[PDB]
Design a protein around this nucleic acid. Structure first.
Ligand SMILES: Nc1nc2c(ncn2[C@H]2C[C@H](O)[C@@H](COP(=O)(O)OP(=O)(O)OP(=O)(O)O)O2)c(=O)[nH]1
Ligand SMILES: [Mg+2]
Ligand SMILES: [Mg+2]
Ligand SMILES: [Mg+2]
Ligand SMILES: [Mg+2]
Length: 341
DNA sequence: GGGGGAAGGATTC
DNA sequence: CACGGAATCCTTCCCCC
């Protein structure tokens, strides 16, 4: 099997550059403004200029301003990035029917048939990069290997505007050389847990009682890491299906007052239902972020689909359940729909 | 004992 | 000072054959 993974470079920012070359060369930071005051919120992403000085997805916008007071700060326009992405995705289908869009800017393609070896794959990669750049003016990085995981790692190593192939030889080397923290699906929480166990590399998972591993990080994550190291990981490329549609917003100020929270909640329901399109959900969860940035939720699954009126009333109930069951003020409130008919 | 959900949370990206 | 959207996974609990 030969997998070719593609990931758009600093995507949201670069889309902004495409729509405004004047920005190119300058540091760009796409932000998600919350409105609790101004310049409150987080950074969705930033071009590489800006990342050099530490401005990156996740950090508070105020930190960014601090480090780069004169970089350009643009509000995130997701609809636009989505439509550009959808276009690029269609373009990618033309290289394989077997395609897995894993995020708004990445996909894994199974080109085992289309190509005969890594030499051609690399050429198919170039073809793809050029096609995308040519057609959409978007640069992307490509990763190619025997399975999705290593394809992803390949592109991570070649970022930005790169393309890399990790052959069976290199896969054997990485299993022994790659810091397990650089392995997809392993965040800072599982990373540290792996160290308390002495594991710093994939191979290390082969020198510990499964039951112990299964103990520390759960069976799923254990079998995942083990199969990878056993060079036996082989998950296929499959079309992913939306299972949840929701929305969540930040309130101007914290609160435990229902009438003060409702307009935010209802706003989130309207937007969610719009996104539902013609999908009918049988489940709904109200999600709340408390003052201490903790996340709490309460939901319910109906035997039938949920109408907007029903979601309106049921959501207030679930919110009341939250407020009655949690003494903390609420910072962010949202709703999520799932289990579509 | 174990199937079959469901609910609430945790981790990752 | 920290948004937002979703998937997957884990634990707990309940109904009952
Ligand atoms: N709002 C928000 N959006 C994010 C976050 N992380 C990623 N995104 C969005 C915007 C990113 O451009 C896009 C693609 O993520 P990547 O993981 O591909 O980062 P990006 O493409 O920006 O840079 P890259 O070349 O992949 O290293 O997804 C986040 O933490 N918050
Ligand atoms: Mg990217
Ligand atoms: Mg990506
Ligand atoms: Mg990782
Ligand atoms: Mg918690």
């Amino acid at each position: 099997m030969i997998v070719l993974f593609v990931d758009f470079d600093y995507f949201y920012a670069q889309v902004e550059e495409v729509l405004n070359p004047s920005l190119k060369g300058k540091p760009v930071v796409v932000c998600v403004f919350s409105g609790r005051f101004e310049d409150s919120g987080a950074v969705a992403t930033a071009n590489y200029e800006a990342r050099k000085f530490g401005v990156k997805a996740g950090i508070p916008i105020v930190e960014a301003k601090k480090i780069l007071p004169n970089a350009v700060y643009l509000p995130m326009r997701k609809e636009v990035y989505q439509q550009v992405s959808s276009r690029i995705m269609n373009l990618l289908r033309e290289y394989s029917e077997k395609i897995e869009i894993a995020s708004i800017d990445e996909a894994y393609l199974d080109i085992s048939d289309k190509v005969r070896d890594y030499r051609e794959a690399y050429n198919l990669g170039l073809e793809i990069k050029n096609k995308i750049l040519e057609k959409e003016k978007i640069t992307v990085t490509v990763g190619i290997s025997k399975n999705k995981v290593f394809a992803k790692i390949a592109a991570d190593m070649a970022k930005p505007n790169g393309i890399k192939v990790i052959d069976d030889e290199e896969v054997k080397r990485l299993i022994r050389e790659l810091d397990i923290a650089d392995v997809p699906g392993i965040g800072n929480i599982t990373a540290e847990k792996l160290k308390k166990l002495g594991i710093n590399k994939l191979v290390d998972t082969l020198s510990i009682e499964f039951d112990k591993l299964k103990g520390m990080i759960g069976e799923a994550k254990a079998k995942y890491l083990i199969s990878l190291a056993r060079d036996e990981y082989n998950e296929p490329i499959r079309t992913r299906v939306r299972k949840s549609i929701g929305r969540i917003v930040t309130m101007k100020r914290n609160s435990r007052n229902l009438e003060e929270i409702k307009p935010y909640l209802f706003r989130a329901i309207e937007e969610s239902y719009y996104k539902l399109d013609k999908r009918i959900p049988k489940a709904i969860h109200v999600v709340a972020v408390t003052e201490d940035l903790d996340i709490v939720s309460r939901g319910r699954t109906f035997p039938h689909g949920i109408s907007k009126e029903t979601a309106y009333s049921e959501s207030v109930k679930l919110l009341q359940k939250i407020l009655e069951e949690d003494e903390r003020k609420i910072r962010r409130i949202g709703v999520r729909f799932s289990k579509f008919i």
